[PDB]
Protein backbone atom coordinates (compact mmCIF):
# COMPACT_ATOMS: atom_id res chain seq x y z
CA UNK A 1 0.00 0.00 0.00
CA UNK A 2 0.85 3.72 -0.24
CA UNK A 3 2.55 5.52 2.68
CA UNK A 4 4.19 8.93 3.20
CA UNK A 5 7.94 9.01 2.41
CA UNK A 6 9.65 11.23 5.02
CA UNK A 7 13.21 12.56 5.34
CA UNK A 8 15.41 12.72 8.48
CA UNK A 9 14.16 16.28 9.14
CA UNK A 10 10.50 15.11 9.20
CA UNK A 11 9.24 16.78 5.98
CA UNK A 12 7.29 14.56 3.55
CA UNK A 13 9.08 13.91 0.22
CA UNK A 14 6.18 12.39 -1.76
CA UNK A 15 4.56 8.97 -1.16
CA UNK A 16 6.26 5.57 -1.60
CA UNK A 17 4.18 2.55 -2.71
CA UNK A 18 4.93 -0.59 -0.66
CA UNK A 19 4.57 -4.11 -2.08
CA UNK A 20 1.05 -5.40 -1.30
CA UNK A 21 2.30 -9.03 -1.10
CA UNK A 22 4.49 -7.99 1.89
CA UNK A 23 2.90 -4.86 3.41
CA UNK A 24 -0.73 -5.29 2.20
CA UNK A 25 -1.74 -8.82 3.33
CA UNK A 26 -4.54 -9.61 5.78
CA UNK A 27 -2.61 -10.31 9.07
CA UNK A 28 -2.88 -13.94 10.23
CA UNK A 29 -3.14 -13.52 14.02
CA UNK A 30 -2.73 -17.27 14.73
CA UNK A 31 0.64 -17.58 12.94
CA UNK A 32 1.87 -14.34 14.58
CA UNK A 33 0.98 -15.88 17.97
CA UNK A 34 2.86 -19.08 17.02
CA UNK A 35 5.85 -17.04 15.74
CA UNK A 36 6.06 -15.00 18.97
CA UNK A 37 5.86 -18.05 21.28
CA UNK A 38 8.43 -19.92 19.18
CA UNK A 39 10.83 -16.95 19.16
CA UNK A 40 10.46 -16.34 22.92
CA UNK A 41 11.01 -20.09 23.48
CA UNK A 42 14.17 -19.95 21.32
CA UNK A 43 15.65 -17.22 23.57
CA UNK A 44 15.43 -19.54 26.62
CA UNK A 45 18.79 -20.78 27.87
CA UNK A 46 17.27 -23.74 29.74
CA UNK A 47 20.23 -24.05 32.15
CA UNK A 48 18.49 -25.53 35.18
CA UNK A 49 19.20 -28.73 37.09
CA UNK A 50 18.51 -30.51 40.36
CA UNK A 51 20.20 -33.52 41.93
CA UNK A 52 18.07 -36.68 41.97
CA UNK A 53 18.75 -39.28 44.69
CA UNK A 54 21.68 -40.76 42.68
CA UNK A 55 23.42 -37.37 42.27
CA UNK A 56 23.14 -36.23 45.92
CA UNK A 57 26.31 -36.76 47.99
CA UNK A 58 26.56 -40.02 49.95
CA UNK A 59 23.37 -41.97 50.70
CA UNK A 60 24.87 -45.39 49.85
CA UNK A 61 24.02 -47.44 52.96
CA UNK A 62 20.64 -48.54 54.29
CA UNK A 63 20.05 -46.11 57.27
CA UNK A 64 18.90 -48.93 59.57
CA UNK A 65 17.82 -52.58 59.31
CA UNK A 66 14.59 -53.41 57.44
CA UNK A 67 12.76 -54.86 60.49
CA UNK A 68 12.71 -54.71 64.29
CA UNK A 69 13.63 -51.07 65.11
CA UNK A 70 10.03 -49.74 65.03
CA UNK A 71 11.03 -47.10 62.43
CA UNK A 72 9.63 -46.73 58.93
CA UNK A 73 11.76 -48.71 56.47
CA UNK A 74 14.30 -46.53 54.64
CA UNK A 75 16.81 -47.33 51.88
CA UNK A 76 19.01 -44.20 51.82
CA UNK A 77 19.41 -40.95 53.76
CA UNK A 78 19.06 -39.19 50.35
CA UNK A 79 15.66 -40.68 49.40
CA UNK A 80 13.31 -37.83 48.30
CA UNK A 81 11.16 -37.73 51.44
CA UNK A 82 14.35 -37.03 53.47
CA UNK A 83 15.46 -33.50 54.25
CA UNK A 84 18.53 -32.97 52.05
CA UNK A 85 17.38 -35.84 49.79
CA UNK A 86 17.21 -36.09 46.00
CA UNK A 87 14.58 -34.18 44.03
CA UNK A 88 11.97 -36.30 42.22
CA UNK A 89 11.90 -35.12 38.59
CA UNK A 90 12.40 -31.35 38.76
CA UNK A 91 14.30 -29.32 36.11
CA UNK A 92 16.88 -30.91 33.82
CA UNK A 93 18.93 -29.03 31.14
CA UNK A 94 16.93 -28.87 27.90
CA UNK A 95 16.26 -26.69 24.85
CA UNK A 96 12.87 -25.06 24.26
CA UNK A 97 13.57 -24.35 20.56
CA UNK A 98 11.45 -25.58 17.66
CA UNK A 99 11.08 -24.49 14.03
CA UNK A 100 7.84 -23.46 12.32
CA UNK A 101 7.52 -24.31 8.56
CA UNK A 102 9.36 -21.75 6.39
CA UNK A 103 6.08 -20.57 4.78
CA UNK A 104 4.64 -19.94 8.28
CA UNK A 105 7.78 -17.93 9.14
CA UNK A 106 7.26 -15.78 6.01
CA UNK A 107 3.54 -15.32 6.72
CA UNK A 108 4.35 -14.23 10.31
CA UNK A 109 6.79 -11.49 9.24
CA UNK A 110 4.48 -10.23 6.44
CA UNK A 111 1.55 -10.24 8.91
CA UNK A 112 3.30 -8.00 11.47
CA UNK A 113 4.76 -5.71 8.76
CA UNK A 114 1.30 -5.39 7.16
CA UNK A 115 -0.14 -4.80 10.67
CA UNK A 116 2.21 -1.78 11.13
CA UNK A 117 0.81 -0.28 7.88
CA UNK A 118 -2.78 -0.75 9.14
CA UNK A 119 -1.93 0.90 12.49
CA UNK A 120 0.01 3.75 10.73
CA UNK A 121 3.20 2.91 12.67
CA UNK A 122 5.39 2.73 9.53
CA UNK A 123 7.75 5.66 8.81
CA UNK A 124 9.49 5.10 5.47
CA UNK A 125 12.56 7.38 5.27
CA UNK A 126 14.30 8.62 2.10
CA UNK A 127 17.63 7.94 3.85
CA UNK A 128 19.05 7.81 7.39
CA UNK A 129 22.60 9.24 7.33
CA UNK A 130 23.97 10.48 10.66
CA UNK A 131 27.25 12.26 9.79
CA UNK A 132 28.74 12.07 13.30
CA UNK A 133 27.89 9.05 15.50
CA UNK A 134 26.09 11.19 18.11
CA UNK A 135 23.14 10.15 20.32
CA UNK A 136 21.88 13.75 20.63
CA UNK A 137 21.40 13.81 16.82
CA UNK A 138 19.54 10.46 16.77
CA UNK A 139 17.34 11.68 19.65
CA UNK A 140 16.65 14.90 17.68
CA UNK A 141 15.71 12.94 14.52
CA UNK A 142 13.28 10.76 16.53
CA UNK A 143 11.68 13.89 18.04
CA UNK A 144 11.56 15.30 14.48
CA UNK A 145 9.55 12.24 13.31
CA UNK A 146 7.29 12.30 16.43
CA UNK A 147 8.68 8.98 17.72
CA UNK A 148 7.85 9.22 21.44
CA UNK A 149 7.69 5.56 22.55
CA UNK A 150 9.67 2.53 21.27
CA UNK A 151 10.96 2.25 17.68
CA UNK A 152 12.68 -0.31 15.43
CA UNK A 153 15.07 1.42 13.00
CA UNK A 154 15.70 -0.70 9.88
CA UNK A 155 18.67 0.14 7.61
CA UNK A 156 19.53 -1.72 4.38
CA UNK A 157 23.17 -2.49 5.27
CA UNK A 158 25.01 -2.27 8.61
CA UNK A 159 25.05 1.50 9.29
CA UNK A 160 27.69 2.09 12.00
CA UNK A 161 26.82 5.71 12.87
CA UNK A 162 23.07 4.98 13.18
CA UNK A 163 23.72 1.80 15.23
CA UNK A 164 26.12 3.61 17.61
CA UNK A 165 23.91 6.73 17.93
CA UNK A 166 20.72 4.78 18.77
CA UNK A 167 22.51 2.21 21.01
CA UNK A 168 22.08 4.11 24.30
CA UNK A 169 18.50 5.40 23.77
CA UNK A 170 16.01 3.17 25.74
CA UNK A 171 13.51 1.31 23.55
CA UNK A 172 15.26 2.08 20.21
CA UNK A 173 16.77 -0.93 18.39
CA UNK A 174 18.65 -0.84 15.07
CA UNK A 175 18.71 -3.81 12.66
CA UNK A 176 19.74 -4.50 9.08
CA UNK A 177 17.04 -5.52 6.57
CA UNK A 178 18.05 -9.20 6.96
CA UNK A 179 17.89 -8.85 10.79
CA UNK A 180 14.13 -8.03 10.91
CA UNK A 181 12.15 -10.49 13.04
CA UNK A 182 8.59 -10.85 14.32
CA UNK A 183 9.36 -10.17 18.00
CA UNK A 184 11.34 -6.95 17.34
CA UNK A 185 8.63 -5.65 14.96
CA UNK A 186 5.76 -6.40 17.39
CA UNK A 187 7.64 -5.13 20.48
CA UNK A 188 8.49 -1.68 18.98
CA UNK A 189 5.57 0.70 18.31
CA UNK A 190 7.05 2.59 15.34
CA UNK A 191 8.90 0.94 12.44
CA UNK A 192 11.44 3.31 10.83
CA UNK A 193 12.55 1.75 7.51
CA UNK A 194 14.75 3.38 4.85
CA UNK A 195 13.68 3.19 1.19
CA UNK A 196 16.76 1.03 0.45
CA UNK A 197 15.76 -1.34 3.28
CA UNK A 198 12.12 -1.65 2.08
CA UNK A 199 13.47 -2.70 -1.36
CA UNK A 200 15.80 -5.20 0.35
CA UNK A 201 12.92 -6.63 2.46
CA UNK A 202 10.65 -6.89 -0.62
CA UNK A 203 13.49 -8.73 -2.45
CA UNK A 204 13.42 -11.54 0.16
CA UNK A 205 9.76 -11.74 1.21
CA UNK A 206 8.01 -11.12 -2.14
Amino acid sequence: PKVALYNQNGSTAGDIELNASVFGIEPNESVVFDAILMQRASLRQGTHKVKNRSEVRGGGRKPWRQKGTGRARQGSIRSPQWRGGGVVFGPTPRSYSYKLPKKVRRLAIKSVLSSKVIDNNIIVLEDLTLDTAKTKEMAAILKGLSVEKKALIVTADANEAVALSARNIPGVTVVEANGINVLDVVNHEKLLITKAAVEKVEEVLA
Partner: protein, 146 residues
Protein backbone atom coordinates in the same frame (compact mmCIF):
# COMPACT_ATOMS: atom_id res chain seq x y z
CA UNK B 1 -0.94 -8.01 17.34
CA UNK B 2 0.27 -6.82 20.77
CA UNK B 3 2.49 -8.68 23.27
CA UNK B 4 0.10 -7.59 26.07
CA UNK B 5 -2.99 -8.96 24.21
CA UNK B 6 -1.75 -12.33 22.89
CA UNK B 7 -4.39 -15.02 22.24
CA UNK B 8 -3.93 -18.60 20.90
CA UNK B 9 -6.13 -19.99 18.12
CA UNK B 10 -9.29 -21.58 19.57
CA UNK B 11 -8.65 -25.28 20.27
CA UNK B 12 -4.88 -24.96 19.60
CA UNK B 13 -3.86 -25.32 23.29
CA UNK B 14 -5.28 -27.38 26.18
CA UNK B 15 -4.34 -27.48 29.87
CA UNK B 16 -2.41 -30.64 30.79
CA UNK B 17 -4.01 -33.13 33.19
CA UNK B 18 -2.21 -33.36 36.57
CA UNK B 19 -3.00 -36.60 38.41
CA UNK B 20 -2.63 -37.12 42.15
CA UNK B 21 -3.67 -33.55 43.07
CA UNK B 22 -6.67 -34.22 45.30
CA UNK B 23 -10.11 -35.77 45.08
CA UNK B 24 -11.96 -32.85 43.42
CA UNK B 25 -10.01 -33.31 40.15
CA UNK B 26 -11.30 -36.90 39.78
CA UNK B 27 -7.68 -38.16 39.46
CA UNK B 28 -6.84 -37.85 43.16
CA UNK B 29 -5.27 -40.66 45.20
CA UNK B 30 -4.92 -43.55 42.72
CA UNK B 31 -4.20 -41.11 39.83
CA UNK B 32 -6.59 -42.88 37.42
CA UNK B 33 -4.81 -46.26 37.85
CA UNK B 34 -7.47 -48.02 39.96
CA UNK B 35 -6.52 -50.39 42.79
CA UNK B 36 -3.41 -52.56 42.98
CA UNK B 37 -2.10 -55.10 40.45
CA UNK B 38 0.77 -54.80 38.01
CA UNK B 39 -0.79 -51.96 35.95
CA UNK B 40 -1.02 -49.61 38.98
CA UNK B 41 2.70 -50.00 39.83
CA UNK B 42 5.51 -47.60 38.94
CA UNK B 43 7.15 -48.98 35.78
CA UNK B 44 4.29 -51.50 35.74
CA UNK B 45 2.37 -53.27 32.98
CA UNK B 46 3.50 -56.09 30.71
CA UNK B 47 5.52 -55.63 27.50
CA UNK B 48 3.67 -54.86 24.19
CA UNK B 49 1.93 -57.93 22.74
CA UNK B 50 2.31 -60.02 25.93
CA UNK B 51 -0.83 -62.11 26.58
CA UNK B 52 -0.10 -63.15 30.19
CA UNK B 53 1.67 -66.35 29.06
CA UNK B 54 -0.87 -67.43 26.41
CA UNK B 55 1.26 -68.11 23.31
CA UNK B 56 1.41 -64.60 21.69
CA UNK B 57 -0.31 -64.03 18.33
CA UNK B 58 2.90 -63.34 16.35
CA UNK B 59 4.46 -66.54 17.73
CA UNK B 60 1.39 -68.69 16.90
CA UNK B 61 1.60 -67.65 13.21
CA UNK B 62 4.30 -68.69 10.68
CA UNK B 63 7.01 -66.46 9.25
CA UNK B 64 6.42 -65.87 5.52
CA UNK B 65 8.64 -65.05 2.57
CA UNK B 66 11.98 -63.31 2.06
CA UNK B 67 13.28 -59.87 1.06
CA UNK B 68 14.92 -59.69 -2.38
CA UNK B 69 18.41 -58.10 -2.17
CA UNK B 70 18.02 -56.70 -5.74
CA UNK B 71 14.43 -55.39 -5.44
CA UNK B 72 13.73 -52.47 -7.80
CA UNK B 73 11.02 -49.98 -6.84
CA UNK B 74 10.17 -47.37 -9.51
CA UNK B 75 8.84 -43.85 -9.05
CA UNK B 76 5.38 -44.36 -10.59
CA UNK B 77 3.81 -41.58 -12.70
CA UNK B 78 0.19 -41.92 -13.86
CA UNK B 79 -1.08 -40.29 -17.08
CA UNK B 80 -2.96 -37.55 -15.15
CA UNK B 81 0.42 -36.21 -13.90
CA UNK B 82 1.70 -35.97 -17.52
CA UNK B 83 -1.26 -33.66 -18.41
CA UNK B 84 0.52 -30.94 -16.36
CA UNK B 85 3.11 -30.61 -19.17
CA UNK B 86 2.36 -28.80 -22.45
CA UNK B 87 2.44 -30.47 -25.89
CA UNK B 88 5.92 -30.96 -27.40
CA UNK B 89 7.65 -31.35 -23.98
CA UNK B 90 10.20 -34.19 -23.84
CA UNK B 91 9.21 -35.64 -20.44
CA UNK B 92 12.51 -37.08 -19.13
CA UNK B 93 13.14 -38.39 -15.55
CA UNK B 94 15.34 -35.31 -14.93
CA UNK B 95 12.43 -32.99 -15.87
CA UNK B 96 9.92 -34.89 -13.67
CA UNK B 97 12.38 -34.69 -10.74
CA UNK B 98 13.22 -30.99 -11.35
CA UNK B 99 9.55 -29.91 -11.67
CA UNK B 100 8.77 -32.08 -8.60
CA UNK B 101 6.23 -34.46 -10.18
CA UNK B 102 8.37 -37.19 -8.59
CA UNK B 103 10.13 -36.58 -5.24
CA UNK B 104 12.75 -39.34 -5.62
CA UNK B 105 13.84 -41.47 -8.59
CA UNK B 106 14.53 -44.87 -6.93
CA UNK B 107 15.21 -47.55 -9.62
CA UNK B 108 13.64 -45.28 -12.27
CA UNK B 109 10.41 -43.80 -13.66
CA UNK B 110 7.55 -46.13 -14.60
CA UNK B 111 4.62 -44.59 -16.50
CA UNK B 112 1.28 -46.14 -15.44
CA UNK B 113 -2.07 -45.86 -17.20
CA UNK B 114 -4.47 -44.41 -14.58
CA UNK B 115 -6.33 -41.24 -15.64
CA UNK B 116 -6.44 -39.61 -19.10
CA UNK B 117 -3.72 -38.15 -21.34
CA UNK B 118 -4.62 -35.47 -23.92
CA UNK B 119 -1.13 -34.12 -24.70
CA UNK B 120 1.29 -35.03 -27.51
CA UNK B 121 4.44 -35.75 -25.45
CA UNK B 122 7.79 -37.45 -26.10
CA UNK B 123 7.68 -39.37 -22.80
CA UNK B 124 11.11 -40.82 -21.94
CA UNK B 125 10.96 -43.28 -19.02
CA UNK B 126 12.66 -46.43 -17.69
CA UNK B 127 9.46 -48.54 -17.78
CA UNK B 128 5.91 -48.29 -19.16
CA UNK B 129 2.76 -50.28 -18.45
CA UNK B 130 1.06 -51.74 -21.55
CA UNK B 131 -1.90 -49.34 -21.19
CA UNK B 132 0.43 -46.35 -20.55
CA UNK B 133 2.51 -47.02 -23.70
CA UNK B 134 -0.81 -47.33 -25.58
CA UNK B 135 -2.17 -44.06 -24.11
CA UNK B 136 1.02 -42.06 -24.88
CA UNK B 137 1.09 -43.38 -28.47
CA UNK B 138 -2.72 -43.06 -28.88
CA UNK B 139 -2.61 -39.27 -28.27
CA UNK B 140 0.15 -38.58 -30.84
CA UNK B 141 3.06 -39.18 -28.41
CA UNK B 142 6.21 -41.33 -28.32
CA UNK B 143 6.92 -43.71 -25.42
CA UNK B 144 10.72 -44.23 -25.35
CA UNK B 145 12.44 -46.77 -23.07
CA UNK B 146 15.65 -45.19 -21.68
Amino acid sequence: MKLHELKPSEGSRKTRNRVGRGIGSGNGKTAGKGHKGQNARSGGGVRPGFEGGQMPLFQRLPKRGFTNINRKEYAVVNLDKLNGFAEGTEVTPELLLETGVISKLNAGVKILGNGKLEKKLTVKANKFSASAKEAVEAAGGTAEVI
